[PDB]
Amino acid sequence: MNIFEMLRIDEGLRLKIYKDTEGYYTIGIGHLLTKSPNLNAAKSELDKAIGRNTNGVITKDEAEKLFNQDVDAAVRGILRNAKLKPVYDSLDAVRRAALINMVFQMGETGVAGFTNSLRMLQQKRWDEAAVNLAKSRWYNQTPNRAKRVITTFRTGTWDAYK
Ligand SMILES: [Cl-]
Ligand SMILES: [Cl-]
């Protein structure tokens, strides 16, 4: 298991514009297109993203290409963030995957806001971090995906994904 397979599981793959759990226009492997309610603002962002007139539909390769950029951007955002970088540096390889997953889902800003959990992770208090992470809108809104990521942080194994 690796970060790509992990996120492919959490996000799925859709080749036609769809609405995410929050109601936003997305395509591929969790690639957010726009927060705007207008399908046309979505198609426009899509075509801009792909470099062709897609009429809201893309191929598997196009989806994978977006996915590659997005994982890469997630890592780089972590590395450039003063609050996140130290956490990531302190973690083992599996737990690093767990942080990247939160960032991809909620952006750097969101994650960086989990001050207390972050501190617990850095200190390696796994059980305590897992309890604090669960006290979040995130967990309440997407409980199954949240439990999987949290177990990953608690255990340092890929069990929740196997
Ligand atoms: Cl893009
Ligand atoms: Cl869920």
From Swiss-Prot:
Top-level class of the enzyme under EC nomenclature: hydrolase
Result when mutating N132 to M/F: 2-fold decrease in enzymatic activity
Tell me the function of this protein. Endolysin with lysozyme activity that degrades host peptidoglycans and participates with the holin and spanin proteins in the sequential events which lead to the programmed host cell lysis releasing the mature viral particles. Once the holin has permeabilized the host cell membrane, the endolysin can reach the periplasm and break down the peptidoglycan layer.
Q: What result is annotated for mutating E11Q? A: Complete loss of activity
Query: Which signals induce this protein?
Result: Expressed late in the viral replication.
Q: InterPro entries, from UniProt? A: Endolysin_T4_type, Glyco_hydro_24, Lysozyme-like_dom_sf, Lysozyme_dom_sf, Phage_lysozyme-like, T4-type_lysozyme
Q: Which residues hold substrate?
A: L32, F104, S117, N132
Its GO biological process annotations read:
cell wall macromolecule catabolic process; defense response to bacterium; peptidoglycan catabolic process; viral release from host cell by cytolysis
Output the Pfam families linked to this UniProt entry: Phage_lysozyme
What are the protein's UniProt keywords?
Answer: Antimicrobial, Bacteriolytic enzyme, Cytolysis, Glycosidase, Host cell lysis by virus, Host cytoplasm, Hydrolase, Viral release from host cell
* Name of the protein in question: Endolysin
PANTHER family with a match to the protein in the record: T4-TYPE LYSOZYME 1-RELATED
User: Subcellular location, in the record's words?
Assistant: Host cytoplasm
* Catalytic activity field: Hydrolysis of (1->4)-beta-linkages between N-acetylmuramic acid and N-acetyl-D-glucosamine residues in a peptidoglycan and between N-acetyl-D-glucosamine residues in chitodextrins
Per UniProt, what does mutating E11N do?
A: Loss of 84% of enzymatic activity
Its family remark reads: Belongs to the glycosyl hydrolase 24 family.
